Amino acid sequence: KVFERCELARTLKRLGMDGYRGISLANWMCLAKWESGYNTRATNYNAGDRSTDYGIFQINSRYWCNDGKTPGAVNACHLSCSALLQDNIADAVACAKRVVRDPQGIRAWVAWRNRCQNRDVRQYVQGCGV
Numbered sequence: 001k002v003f004e005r006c007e008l009a010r011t012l013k014r015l016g017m018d019g020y021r022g023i024s025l026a027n028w029m030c031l032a033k034w035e036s037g038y039n040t041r042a043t044n045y046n047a048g049d050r051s052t053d054y055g056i057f058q059i060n061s062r063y064w065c066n067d068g069k070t071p072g073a074v075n076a077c078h079l080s081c082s083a084l085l086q087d088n089i090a091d092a093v094a095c096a097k098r099v100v101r102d103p104q105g106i107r108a109w110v111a112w113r114n115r116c117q118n119r120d121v122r123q124y125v126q127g128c129g130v
């Protein structure tokens with residue numbers, strides 16, 4: 001499923017993402033946009049370290065979810081990577097909250113660092129009623 005912008009904003013707000021660890025809904029929207037274009041089926045394989053990023057938040061298989069084929073995986077979210085490919089994003093959000101609880105926080109997402117950080121991101125939520 002490829003979410004509509006305001007549709008996703010309302011969904012994340014309902015799931016407790018607005019202001020989670022001080023992170024605004026607009027920041028979460030900015031990173032979903034650049035990481036996956038709001039697509040829950042998005043997957044990207046890293047030939048280099050042999051790991052895969054899954055879903056709307058592009059969560060990596062080495063540290064967060066288990067896909068069974070990644071060397072040295074940890075599975076900190078205690079989730080099967082397939083759960084991050086569902087149309088329902090509840091599991092994705094719970095895992096995304098777990099990621100930000102680690103030392104580096106939101107800096108774990110390459111896309112936030114390159115396109116969202118120190119940038120005005122209000123345009124991601126304007127007109128959504130959130």
Ligand SMILES: *[C@@H]1O[C@H](CO)[C@@H](O[C@@H]2O[C@H](CO)[C@@H](O)[C@H](O)[C@H]2NC(C)=O)[C@H](O)[C@H]1NC(C)=O
Nearest residue numbers: 057058059060061063064099102103104108109
């Ligand atoms: C993106 O990949 C990087 C590593 O390529 C992940 O960062 C690691 O995260 C673990 C767990 O917090 C840390 O112990 C490592 O020190 C981090 N490594 C580096 C180089 O920063 C990052 O968590 C992944 N992001 C997502 C969203 O899965």
